[PDB]
Amino acid sequence: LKKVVALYDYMPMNANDLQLRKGDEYFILEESNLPWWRARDKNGQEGYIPSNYVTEAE
Numbered sequence: 937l938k939k940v941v942a943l944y945d946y947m948p949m950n951a952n953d954l955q956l957r958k959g960d961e962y963f964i965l966e967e968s969n970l971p972w973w974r975a976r977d978k979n980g981q982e983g984y985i986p987s988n989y990v991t992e993a994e
Contacts, residue, residue, distance in 0.1 A: 938964030940975060940993030946986050954983030956990065964993045 940963075942956035953972060954962060960978030962985045967973040972984040975993070987994030 938967075938975070938993040940964060940973070940985060940987050941991040942977070942985075943989040943991055946989065948983060950984050952983035954979070954981055954985045956986070961992060962990065967993075 939961045941961035942958050944956065944958055946956035948955055950972060954977040962975040962977045964973050964975045965982060971988040972986050975985040976982040
């Protein structure tokens, strides 16, 4: 259901943000009141993913 797909390369600047690779989608293993959530990119890595950009979940 939650598959926020990256959009523009975004490096991690908080703690475990999943570096976006524009293309691979991301699953929201958890969300919050911020733009970055707790998803695992298609690289099989759990980290914080930004929704302000990307696509799908957000």
